[PDB]
Paper text:
The heterotrimeric RNA-dependent RNA polymerase (RdRp) of influenza virus is composed of subunits PA, PB1 and PB2. Transcription of viral mRNAs occurs through a unique “cap-snatching” mechanism. We initially screened metal-chelating compounds by CEN enzymatic assays, followed by a cellular phenotypic screen and then optimized the chemical structure to improve the pharmacokinetics and safety.
To verify the reduced endonuclease activity of the I38T mutant, we purified the isolated endonuclease domain from influenza A and B virus polymerase with either Ile or Thr at position 38. For influenza A, we used residues 1–198 from strain A/California/04/2009 (pH1N1) with truncation of the flexible loop (Δ52–64:Gly), as previously described. All four PA-BXA co-crystal structures exhibit clear and unambiguous electron density for the compound, which is bound in essentially the identical fashion in each structure. When this residue is mutated to the more polar threonine, the structure is essentially unchanged in both the FluA and FluB structures except for the side-chain of the residue. The side-chain of T38 is orientated such that its methyl-group is in exactly the same position as the CG1 of Ile38, whereas the OH group is orientated towards helix α3 allowing it to make two hydrogen bonds to the main-chain carbonyl oxygens of Met34 and Leu35. Furthermore, unlike I38, which does not change conformation upon BXA binding, T38 (and M34 in the case of FluB) have to change rotamer to accommodate the inhibitor binding. These two effects (less favourable van der Waals packing and induced fit change of threonine rotamer) plausibly account for the reduced affinity of the inhibitor for the I38T variant and hence the lower susceptibility of viruses bearing this mutation. The results show a 10-fold reduced activity of the I38T mutant endonuclease in vitro for both FluA and FluB (black triangles).
Numbering used by the authors: -4 to 51, 73 to 198
Write the structure that this text describes.
Amino acid sequence: GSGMAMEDFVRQCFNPMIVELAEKAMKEYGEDPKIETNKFAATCTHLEVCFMYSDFKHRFEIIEGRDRIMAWTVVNSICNTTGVEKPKFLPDLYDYKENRFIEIGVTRREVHIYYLEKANKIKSEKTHIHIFSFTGEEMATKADYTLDEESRARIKTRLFTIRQEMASRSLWDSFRQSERGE
Ligand SMILES: O=C1c2c(O)c(=O)ccn2N([C@@H]2c3ccccc3SCc3c2ccc(F)c3F)[C@@H]2COCCN12
Ligand SMILES: [Mn+2]
Ligand SMILES: [Mn+2]
């Protein structure tokens, strides 16, 4: 259940491309993945979900996984060619079919609680929110889940698998409790 154990878990259970992008994002925002090991795992998990979401004719542009400048450059380019309003906060994806940005949330807590937190932090009723748990639960803006049932099933399964792999190593309890502060 240690810090070293969690860092080792992350580097073993996530593909090297995900790990590298997560490390770069954490450094960009001033956090050390060797100290904030649960956050390291959280960023890898969330990045993987974004990449799995964008697979499932490229319907989706991935904003996440890019450095800050390139992320906003992509966002501005989309807004210039679609007239969609520029979001105040960086989103995770752009849906070319529905022509809307998407914010992806992954939570170790109840989805309704996290969904409210997300909706409150953005306040822009134009970014579509989609929350996943590690328990197979899901909540999205207007109960519009965007993807088909099978695509969401595989994301839920992968998240549950991560949870079980953590639990087998006694890492899940720590990971769960670090999402929200005291
Ligand atoms: O893109 C995100 C982001 C999300 O998209 C999200 O859903 C939750 C959280 N985020 N944050 C991610 C992040 C992403 C995934 C899981 C946990 C965290 S926790 C804060 C943090 C993030 C990235 C690097 C870092 F050092 C951080 F401390 C930051 C929020 O500022 C815009 C960029 N960003
Ligand atoms: Mn993001
Ligand atoms: Mn997100």
